[PDB]
Design an enzyme around this catalytic site. Structure first.
Site, PDB file in Angstrom:
ATOM      1  CG  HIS A  70      27.183 -51.462  71.069  1.00 45.03           C
ATOM      2  ND1 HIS A  70      28.424 -51.047  70.633  1.00 45.03           N
ATOM      3  CD2 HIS A  70      26.462 -50.331  71.279  1.00 45.03           C
ATOM      4  CE1 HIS A  70      28.441 -49.728  70.546  1.00 45.03           C
ATOM      5  NE2 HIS A  70      27.264 -49.268  70.939  1.00 45.03           N
ATOM      6  CG  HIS A  97      20.037 -48.161  68.538  1.00 39.43           C
ATOM      7  ND1 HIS A  97      20.206 -46.832  68.864  1.00 39.43           N
ATOM      8  CD2 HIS A  97      19.584 -48.772  69.659  1.00 39.43           C
ATOM      9  CE1 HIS A  97      19.902 -46.655  70.138  1.00 39.43           C
ATOM     10  NE2 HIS A  97      19.527 -47.817  70.643  1.00 39.43           N
ATOM     11  CG  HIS A  99      18.384 -52.544  72.512  1.00 41.01           C
ATOM     12  ND1 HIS A  99      19.617 -52.428  73.114  1.00 41.01           N
ATOM     13  CD2 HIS A  99      18.006 -51.282  72.186  1.00 41.01           C
ATOM     14  CE1 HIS A  99      19.956 -51.150  73.184  1.00 41.01           C
ATOM     15  NE2 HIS A  99      19.000 -50.435  72.620  1.00 41.01           N
ATOM     16  CG  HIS A 122      15.807 -47.670  71.857  1.00 45.11           C
ATOM     17  ND1 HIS A 122      16.758 -48.205  72.701  1.00 45.11           N
ATOM     18  CD2 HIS A 122      14.608 -47.944  72.419  1.00 45.11           C
ATOM     19  CE1 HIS A 122      16.158 -48.758  73.741  1.00 45.11           C
ATOM     20  NE2 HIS A 122      14.855 -48.621  73.589  1.00 45.11           N
ATOM     21  CB  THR A 200      19.843 -48.489  77.740  1.00 49.24           C
ATOM     22  OG1 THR A 200      19.885 -48.734  76.331  1.00 49.24           O
ATOM     23  CG2 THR A 200      18.488 -47.833  78.126  1.00 49.24           C
ATOM     24  CB  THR A 201      25.094 -48.331  75.733  1.00 49.78           C
ATOM     25  OG1 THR A 201      24.996 -47.161  74.917  1.00 49.78           O
ATOM     26  CG2 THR A 201      24.201 -49.411  75.154  1.00 49.78           C
TER      27      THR A 201
HETATM   28  C1  LIG Z   1      25.553 -43.036  70.210  1.00 43.53           C
HETATM   29  C2  LIG Z   1      24.310 -42.828  71.043  1.00 43.53           C
HETATM   30  O1  LIG Z   1      23.321 -42.203  70.604  1.00 43.53           O
HETATM   31  N1  LIG Z   1      24.328 -43.353  72.274  1.00 43.53           N
HETATM   32  C3  LIG Z   1      23.336 -44.257  72.724  1.00 43.53           C
HETATM   33  N2  LIG Z   1      23.574 -45.038  73.821  1.00 43.53           N
HETATM   34  N3  LIG Z   1      22.367 -45.655  74.339  1.00 43.53           N
HETATM   35  C4  LIG Z   1      21.355 -45.240  73.559  1.00 43.53           C
HETATM   36  S1  LIG Z   1      19.740 -45.785  73.876  1.00 43.53           S
HETATM   37  N4  LIG Z   1      19.924 -47.385  73.785  1.00 43.53           N
HETATM   38  O2  LIG Z   1      19.338 -45.458  75.232  1.00 43.53           O
HETATM   39  O3  LIG Z   1      18.827 -45.323  72.839  1.00 43.53           O
HETATM   40  S2  LIG Z   1      21.787 -44.193  72.270  1.00 43.53           S
HETATM   41 ZN   LIG Z   2      18.854 -48.350  72.492  1.00 47.81          ZN
END
Ligand SMILES: CC(=O)Nc1nnc(S(N)(=O)=O)s1
Ligand SMILES: [Zn+2]
EC number: 4.2.1.1
Length: 259
Positions: A70, A97, A99, A122, A200-201
């Site tokens: 993802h 990571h 988006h 992020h 946000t996941t």
């Molecule tokens: C594995 C982990 O860290 N979980 C996350 N899920 N959403 C995230 S976020 N997009 O809000 O930075 S990080």
């Molecule tokens: Zn994120």
């Protein structure tokens, strides 16, 4: 749930059933969710929001980067940390990571004054707790990415690595590089927005203190496109990885502050 969580684009691009964002479970349907739109002139100045201290951000490392199905994620392994930034504690860096989309006017999770950017990066950190889980267990640093014609040399190790991890669960090693290589110039990072929200996941846990920096990262259009051109959501390679973006959530009774 009746099936795996996905982004809208995945459901639209495949006949394999998945759970789109409005249907997400866990804590995803609670009332302190992220991302949000930030009205920048309505965020109140809080003088206690001072400069960040980035530790280990300047050091050249060979980072492990992976396709997690993802996003693309760098493993930071506590090799960096932050303090200051109005934060109540230092926080250890866990992963970085992104988006994105493939159109310049969308791709970020957060919007500033109704404007989405081409990507959002992020950097996820965990709180160094004391004896007294909390609303601020996780500190995420969000950087908006603006598409242009400027080649961002700092991003090249990451962009070049993408060809090597097209499918979920694939990992590779990036050429020597620092986290600062990925960020705007440090002096430009004094201006940021702050609020409490969620990951946000799924399971969208309400344990994030958010920072959204005002200064965008400049990336060339084709460096951004390289993400959707080289990455896939599935090992079948039927759906290019893009529009991995949660829809906007309501601020509700929360307050957004700024430095
Ligand atoms: C594995 C982990 O860290 N979980 C996350 N899920 N959403 C995230 S976020 N997009 O809000 O930075 S990080
Ligand atoms: Zn994120």
């Amino acid at each position: 749930a009746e099936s795996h969580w996905c982004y809208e684009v995945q459901a639209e691009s495949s006949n394999y059933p998945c759970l789109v964002p409005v249907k997400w479970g866990g804590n995803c349907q609670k009332d302190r969710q992220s991302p949000i739109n930030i009205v920048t002139t309505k965020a109140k100045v809080d003088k206690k929001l001072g400069r960040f201290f980035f530790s280990g951000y300047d050091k050249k490392q060979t980072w492990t980067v992976q396709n997690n199905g993802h996003s693309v994620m760098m493993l930071l392994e506590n090799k960096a940390s932050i303090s200051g930034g109005g934060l109540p504690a230092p926080y250890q860096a866990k992963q970085l990571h992104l988006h994105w989309s493939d159109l310049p006017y969308k791709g970020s999770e957060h919007s500033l004054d109704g404007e989405h950017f081409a990507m959002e990066m992020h950097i996820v950190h965990e709180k160094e707790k004391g004896t007294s889980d909390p609303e601020d267990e996780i500190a995420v640093l969000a950087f908006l990415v603006e598409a242009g014609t400027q080649v961002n040399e700092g991003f090249q190790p990451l962009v070049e690595a993408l060809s090597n991890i097209p499918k979920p669960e694939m990992s590779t090693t990036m050429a020597e590089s620092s986290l600062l290589d990925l960020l705007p110039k440090e002096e430009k990072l004094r201006h940021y927005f702050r609020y409490l929200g969620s990951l946000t996941t799924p399971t969208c846990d309400e344990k994030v203190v958010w920072t959204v920096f005002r200064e965008p990262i400049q990336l060339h259009r084709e460096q951004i496109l390289a993400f959707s051109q080289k990455l896939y959501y599935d090992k079948e390679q039927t759906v290019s990885m893009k529009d991995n973006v949660r829809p906007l959530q309501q601020l509700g009774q929360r307050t957004v502050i700024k430095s």
